[PDB]
């Protein structure tokens, strides 16, 4: 387990009585800029966004989906023309949060006006104190 | 969006007589409506209505503040807000508590000067937004 309440965030490996069930199945290991992967998917996000500056803002984005507690009324997307550094990094974002952390849902949930009170809408309730959401593209 | 009141069981809710509808695949059981109704609408509804038990209790206002971080100069109607109201301040007890004791002490006001009855107070703002939608709304 990993508590981030404090900086650094503090790995426990021994006896605690904190009330966790939930988790992923990736190790954790310290930020490591000298691993060749790490080098490797630097590059890579570099090359995707060449901004600097948008570089920065979208990582620190993306370096909120990891707590699940109360967070500001921000929503964002990002397009394209198509073939584009897209779907590439979500499904690595989505995969390293994992089952419990993250899940997929559908466009259907804004395309549709109003669900009927009969109408058994599920998707509502999905995201359940997983932290991060995305939506796959369409046709 | 805008949307239209139907007037769909209008004086069926508006009644205190106790009434019920078809569950889930269940049975009915009336049930007294004891709730006090309100409404916050951005955009107008749509009035069909000549039967004096209608348009007689039912009580309008029009809101005269807009609230943007930025206030305009030398405008009330436009004034500063707090987006921390709406993001935070929920989980203060603190808050909750004091909110609490000025709703129970203003019942007990109410309580005591007329005599638990909200119909015994009227106001100069009220009834008059009420008494230009009834006039307008009109086809």
Same mark, same amino acid.
């Given at each position: 387990?990993?508590?981030?309440?404090?900086?650094?965030?503090?790995?426990?490996?021994?006896?605690?009585?904190?009330?966790?069930?939930?988790?992923?199945?990736?190790?954790?290991?310290?930020?490591?800029?000298? @691993?060749?992967? %790490?080098? +490797?998917?630097?590059?890579?996000?570099?090359?995707?966004?060449?901004?600097?500056?948008?570089? $920065?803002? #979208?990582?620190?984005?993306?370096?909120?989906?990891?707590?699940?507690?109360?967070?500001?009324?921000?929503?964002?997307?990002?397009?394209?023309?198509?073939? @584009?550094?897209? %779907?590439? +990094?979500?499904?690595?974002?989505?995969?390293?949060?994992?089952?419990?952390?993250?899940?997929? $849902?559908? #466009?259907?949930?804004?395309?549709?006006?109003?669900?009927?009170?009969?109408?058994?809408?599920?998707?509502?309730?999905?995201?359940?104190?997983?932290?991060?959401?995305?939506?796959?593209?369409?046709? | 969006?805008?949307?239209?009141?139907?007037?769909?069981?209008?004086?069926?809710?508006?009644?205190?007589?106790?009434?019920?509808?078809?569950?889930?695949?269940?049975?009915?059981?009336?049930?007294?409506?004891?709730?006090?109704?309100?409404?916050?609408?951005?955009?107008?509804?749509?009035?069909?209505?000549?039967?004096?038990?209608?348009?007689?209790?039912?009580?309008?206002?029009?809101?005269?503040?807009?609230?943007?971080?930025?206030?305009?100069?030398?405008?009330?109607?436009?004034?500063?807000?707090?987006?921390?109201?709406?993001?935070?301040?929920?989980?203060?007890?603190?808050?909750?508590?004091?909110?609490?004791?000025?709703?129970?002490?203003?019942?007990?006001?109410?309580?005591?000067?007329?005599?638990?009855?909200?119909?015994?107070?009227?106001?100069?703002?009220?009834?008059?937004?009420?008494?230009?939608?009834?006039?307008?709304?009109?086809?």
């Amino acid at each position: 387990v990993l508590s981030i309440e404090t900086i650094p965030a503090k790995l426990i490996n021994h006896f605690h009585e904190h009330p966790i069930h939930q988790y992923t199945h990736i190790c954790y290991v310290p930020f490591n800029p000298e @691993n060749p992967w %790490t080098k +490797l998917l630097l590059n890579a996000l570099q090359d995707i966004i060449p901004e600097l500056d948008a570089r $920065l803002w #979208i990582m620190f984005y993306l370096s909120t989906a990891i707590f699940r507690g109360l967070k500001e009324a921000l929503m964002l997307l990002w397009l394209g023309g198509g073939c @584009n550094g897209k %779907t590439f +990094l979500m499904r690595l974002v989505a995969m390293v949060l994992g089952d419990h952390y993250a899940s997929k $849902l559908n #466009i259907s949930l804004l395309t549709s006006c109003r669900e009927t009170a009969e109408k058994p809408n599920s998707a509502f309730m999905r995201l359940k104190g997983r932290g991060y959401g995305y939506f796959e593209e369409t046709n | 969006k805008s949307e239209v009141l139907n007037t769909s069981r209008l004086k069926e809710m508006v009644n205190p007589g106790d009434v019920t509808a078809r569950e889930l695949n269940q049975k009915q059981e009336s049930f007294q409506m004891t709730a006090t109704m309100v409404a916050a609408s951005n955009y107008n509804f749509i009035i069909d209505t000549t039967d004096h038990g209608t348009w007689r209790r039912l009580r309008h206002y029009r809101s005269k503040v807009k609230f943007c971080h930025n206030p305009d100069p030398s405008n009330p109607y436009e004034k500063k807000e707090d987006p921390r109201f709406i993001h935070e301040y929920i989980m203060d007890p603190d808050c909750q508590n004091a909110f609490f004791s000025i709703l129970v002490y203003f019942w007990e006001k109410l309580q005591k000067e007329y005599n638990g009855q909200i119909k015994k107070v009227f106001c100069p703002t009220i009834e008059s937004e009420t008494e230009a939608y009834r006039k307008s709304q009109d086809t």
